[PDB]
Amino acid sequence: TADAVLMIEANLDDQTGEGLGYVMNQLLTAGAYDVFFTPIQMKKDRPATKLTVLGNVNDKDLLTKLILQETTTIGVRYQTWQRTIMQRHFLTVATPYGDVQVKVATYQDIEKKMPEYADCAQLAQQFHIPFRTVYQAALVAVDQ
Amino acid sequence: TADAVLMIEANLDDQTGEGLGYVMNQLLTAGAYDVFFTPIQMKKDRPATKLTVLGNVNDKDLLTKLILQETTTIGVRYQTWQRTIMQRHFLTVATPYGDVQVKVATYQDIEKKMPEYADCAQLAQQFHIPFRTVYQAALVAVDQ
Amino acid sequence: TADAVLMIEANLDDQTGEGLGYVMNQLLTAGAYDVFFTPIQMKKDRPATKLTVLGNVNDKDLLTKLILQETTTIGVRYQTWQRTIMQRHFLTVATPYGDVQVKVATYQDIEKKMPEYADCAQLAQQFHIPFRTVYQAALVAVDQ
Amino acid sequence: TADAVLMIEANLDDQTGEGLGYVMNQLLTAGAYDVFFTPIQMKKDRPATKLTVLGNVNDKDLLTKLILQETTTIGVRYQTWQRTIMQRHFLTVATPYGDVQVKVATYQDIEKKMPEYADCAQLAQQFHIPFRTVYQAALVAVDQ
Amino acid sequence: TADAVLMIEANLDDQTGEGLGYVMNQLLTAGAYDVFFTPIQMKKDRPATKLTVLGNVNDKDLLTKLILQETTTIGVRYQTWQRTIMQRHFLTVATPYGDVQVKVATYQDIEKKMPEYADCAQLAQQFHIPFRTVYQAALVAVDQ
Amino acid sequence: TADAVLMIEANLDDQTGEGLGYVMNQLLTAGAYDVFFTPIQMKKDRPATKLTVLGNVNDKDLLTKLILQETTTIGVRYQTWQRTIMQRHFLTVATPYGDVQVKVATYQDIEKKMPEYADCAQLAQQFHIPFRTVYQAALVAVDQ
């Protein structure tokens, strides 16, 4: 399918990383689609960080306000981007360690399957096997 | 308030950092709002740098020409972004080390205060105390 | 001259670098103008990579499909950017090591010359001199 | 004072960030002093990640086996570094938003105070004030 | 087991990525165990690159002279690191797309299997299937 | 030749780039051989910076105390590295834009010449020509 997404950016040369991990969780809590950090270099020998937020266009006011309230930035910049998304569906698969949800993504003539992280990570911690072991066991089980 | 900003980008896989520090100062001298470096990885095992310039839209021709004249790039790409900016005002505050300008930023119902860097850095160098000491003394003094 | 370019982006927190070097060569093989990697930091302590592709706007469907087929991403985002490009021409120059193609770039009143990489690299490997030696010999020879 | 710390490194070009965020939690849980990710660029156009682990030098075997079991790497490299650490103790300080434990670090004639994050984050989420507001409120409060 | 590897580093702020990709190929050709690029930020607003070379400690002179001849740097620094490497051997495994050599690495009681990239890339380009498809097909196949 | 250099490192997740650019100027002023910033990713979703300082090994105390006084870090780690440095001397060379001091570096049978930046930058700003133009003009001029 197709949709649109707002991208909000901010350059922070006077902001600590501690506060940035806080703002990333606030934004995700607020419903941002995605949030990420880009290492950038700014004037006067400043190692800096660019904060990027992807979100719903109707959420523009909320995520702007969070950024302006929680970080040191005086302004933000935003742009709308177009999107092309694959259609999702999930299969639950039985492994020696429990059920594992596999996300099957399709688009036109593409079909691919991603074992979900939280499932694999929870079971590996429960039976103390490596995360790759649960992952591989999920692939093996989705063979049928 | 609200405004618009042009963003100009360039990928440089055949450009030294020495020349890049020169171009960043030329652009800031020319009135760029902001200029930053993003580390990027390009084809044929090239560690590269993306040069981003933010500027006034009527300055598009100048900053383009600077980039094309001073760097190795054959083309630049540019886009206009929308902005949401907080309203600024400054308070000058008295510290045991001298006056320090505090930038108070407001937007709707947000109010935050940033001690200015050059003020704090100049006074710390003058009295050889750590930059954090002048910073904290500025916060303390803006308490009233 | 002037033209427009599509920019396609994708954030990959569940993708290996091996597969990324493969997708970068597939995209360049498919006619992408440029492809690059940006190191980014995503949620849940994930060091991640942003994949950026620049391309012809009529190639949007191909490069999207490559990204969605070959990487783990569920969606891509794209935007059109405007371009300002210099006019190219090439001079072939004679060096003690052979002919070397120099790319001369002009725009309005700017004129700059870039010795081409593959030429210099091939000759340096053939006569085992440093790449800088062939480069400098090319500049010296384009003096006339 | 003087002390030592083991540094373990591993270059991972075939490892997802998802798995990397997982192994970072395993390593801290395993008693690593610190763990961090450095973006690096490896052969064959691979965007990659360097994993660095700091720990007690007697933990070489523990943290070695953890890295070899949970990540994809064939080998790790390790070296001992000397350390100089400040003395810590904590003060509870009264702020307009509540008490905050401030961390006081000393070394010879150096003394600096860092308000603790979790306290500040705790008060900020409880009173819907910005994290920067409480942090600064603590700094000002720690003046006496 | 236990072993040692020489690490050579050099900070390059006046070196293009083009030349860096070239020297990376020279170094691997010269018998370096590994080579990678780290983005770093140096004085005077310079976006720069750290070159790290791993090699046999008896190669100090070879790889030193290579770095000093082919790059722009005035000096390099080097240190010996200890290593812990897993035992490798290769299995050919039958997949729906063909045979794939899988790399089996062992250390004490740890055993993990990584399908090889070039085989997977070879089958993927031949049958126009995604690299992730063959890799997963190998993982599932290597279960027995 | 052979020599040694002290390397001091510190991981800073609660430190602004503003303060980092400041401490970089303090460190160079304090006689550090070199200082650079590496973007790193630390626990709890923190975009962070690694500070590396190179110096004389007898400066351990000077540069240690500087880092502990001016930055936020609780500890630093340090190690001695061996060095191999080329011999420098400077030539003044005649270019169409003026005389430029070129730096000639030697080691055994290796000889390379790097025109100096500040001279090139000086002539470029004076005659409004590109820095790449003067640099290349120097390279060509240094052929004899």
- Number of Cβ within 10 Å of residue C113's Cβ equals 18
Query: CA nearest E7: which of A37, D50, A73?
Result: D50
Which chain C residues are closer than 8 Å to A79 by Cβ? 79
Q: Cβ of B89 under 8 Å from any chain C Cβ?
A: no
Helix axes C117-127, E17-29, angle to 10 degrees: 30
Query: CA nearest D52: which of E108, F107, E38?
Result: E38
Q: Cβ of B69 under 8 Å from any chain F Cβ?
A: yes
Residue count of chain B, please give it.
Answer: 144
Q: Cβ of B35 under 8 Å from any chain A Cβ?
A: yes
How far is E54 from E29, CA to CA, in rounded Å?
Answer: 13
Asked if residues E81 and D79 have their Cβ atoms less than 8 Å apart, the reply is: yes
How far is A137 from E142, CA to CA, in rounded Å?
Answer: 11
CA-based torsion, E113, E117, E123, E129: positive or negative: positive
Task: Give the residue from chain D lying closest to B39, CA to CA.
Answer: D39
- Number of Cβ within 10 Å of residue E95's Cβ equals 22
Which pair of tokens denotes residue B60?
């598009």
Question: Resolution in A, one decimal?
Answer: 2.0
Nearest CA-CA distance, residue C112 and chain F, Å = 8
Query: CA nearest A15: which of A53, A62, A51, A44?
Result: A51
How far from chain centre, in Å, is Cα E52?
11
Kindly give the residue spans of alpha helices, DSSP state H, lying in D3-130: 17-29, 60-70, 117-127
Which amino acid is residue D95, in one-letter code? T
How far is A70 from D131, CA to CA, in rounded Å?
Answer: 7
| Strand F87-95 relative to strand F98-107, pairing | antiparallel
Burial class (CB in 10 A: 0-12, 13-18, 19+), A45: buried
Distances from the Cα of F2 to the Cα of A14, A98, E68, angstroms: 41, 60, 14
Neighbours of chain C (3+ CB pairs under 8 A): A, B, D, E, F
The full DSSP string for D84-102 is EE-EEEEEEEEETTEEEEE
Burial class (CB in 10 A: 0-12, 13-18, 19+), E122: middle
Across chain C, how many H-helices and E-strands are there?
A: 4, 7
Query: CA nearest A36: which of A48, A20, A59, A58?
Result: A20
> Hey, of F8, F23, F37, F41, which one would you mutate to test binding to chain D, going by the most D CBs within 10 A of its CB?
F41
CA-based torsion, E57, E58, E63, E68: positive or negative: positive
Nearest CA-CA distance, residue E54 and chain B, Å = 17
Asked if residues E103 and D58 have their Cβ atoms less than 8 Å apart, the reply is: no
Which chain E residues are closer than 8 Å to F39 by Cβ? 39
Asked if residues A115 and A138 have their Cβ atoms less than 8 Å apart, the reply is: yes
> Hey, of C36, C80, C102, C139, which one would you mutate to test binding to chain B, going by the most B CBs within 10 A of its CB?
C36
Q: Using the beta-carbon criterion (under 8 Å), do F36 and E42 form an inter-chain contact? A: yes
Which pair of tokens denotes residue F67?
């880092």
Asked if residues A117 and A125 have their Cβ atoms less than 8 Å apart, the reply is: no
Separation of first and last alpha carbons in chain E:
28
How far is C106 from C87, CA to CA, in rounded Å?
Answer: 5
- Number of Cβ within 10 Å of residue A144's Cβ equals 6
Asked if residues C88 and C103 have their Cβ atoms less than 8 Å apart, the reply is: yes
Asked if residues D2 and D15 have their Cβ atoms less than 8 Å apart, the reply is: no
Nearest CA-CA distance, residue C76 and chain A, Å = 5
Residue B93 carries which DSSP code?
A: E
Experimental approach? X-ray
How far from chain centre, in Å, is Cα B129?
26
Burial class (CB in 10 A: 0-12, 13-18, 19+), D128: exposed
Distances from the Cα of E99 to the Cα of A143, E104, E116, E122, E132, angstroms: 18, 15, 11, 11, 16
Which chain F residues are closer than 8 Å to A16 by Cβ? 13-16
Query: CA nearest D100: which of D72, D64, D140?
Result: D140
Q: Which of D43, D75, D76 comes nearest E35 by C-beta?
A: D43
CA-based torsion, F13, F18, F23, F25: positive or negative: positive
Which pair of tokens denotes residue B36?
């930053």
Compute the C-alpha angle D39/D61/D38, nearest 5°. 5
Separation of first and last alpha carbons in chain C:
28
Distances from the Cα of A30 to the Cα of A34, A71, D120, angstroms: 11, 15, 20
How far from chain centre, in Å, is Cα A12?
21
Which amino acid is residue A135, in one-letter code? Y
How far is E34 from E20, CA to CA, in rounded Å?
Answer: 14
| Strand E3-12 relative to strand D3-12, pairing | unpaired
Which residues is E87 bridged to in the sheet? E106
Strands (E), chain F: 3-12, 34-42, 46-55, 75-85, 87-95, 98-107, 110-115
How far is D40 from D11, CA to CA, in rounded Å?
Answer: 8
Q: Which helix (H) or strand (E) holds A136?
A: helix A131-142
| CB contact burial F17-38 (16+ within 10 A = b; e otherwise) | bbbbbbbbebbbebebbbbbbb
F78: CB partners within 8 A, 6+ apart: D81, D82, D83, D84, F6, F7, F8, F9, F60, F64
The dihedrals phi and psi of F108, each to the nearest 5 degrees, come to 50, -105
How far is B54 from B3, CA to CA, in rounded Å?
Answer: 13
Residue count of chain E, please give it.
Answer: 144
Burial class (CB in 10 A: 0-12, 13-18, 19+), E128: exposed
Burial class (CB in 10 A: 0-12, 13-18, 19+), F103: middle
Q: What residue ranges do the domains of chain D occupy?
A: 1-83, 84-144
Q: Which helix (H) or strand (E) holds B101?
A: strand B98-107
Tokens 């690191």 belong to residue: E81
The full DSSP string for chain E is --EEEEEEEEEESS--HHHHHHHHHHHHHTT-SEEEEEEEEETTTEEEEEEEEEE-GGGHHHHHHHHHHHS--SEEEEEEEEEEE-EEEEEEEEETTEEEEEEEEEETTEEEEEE-HHHHHHHHHHHT--HHHHHHHHHHHTT-
D105: CB partners within 8 A, 6+ apart: D86, D87, D88, D111, D112, D113, D114, F74
Q: Cβ of B62 under 8 Å from any chain C Cβ?
A: no
Compute the C-alpha angle C28/C76/D41, nearest 5°. 50
Which pair of tokens denotes residue C66?
């490559």
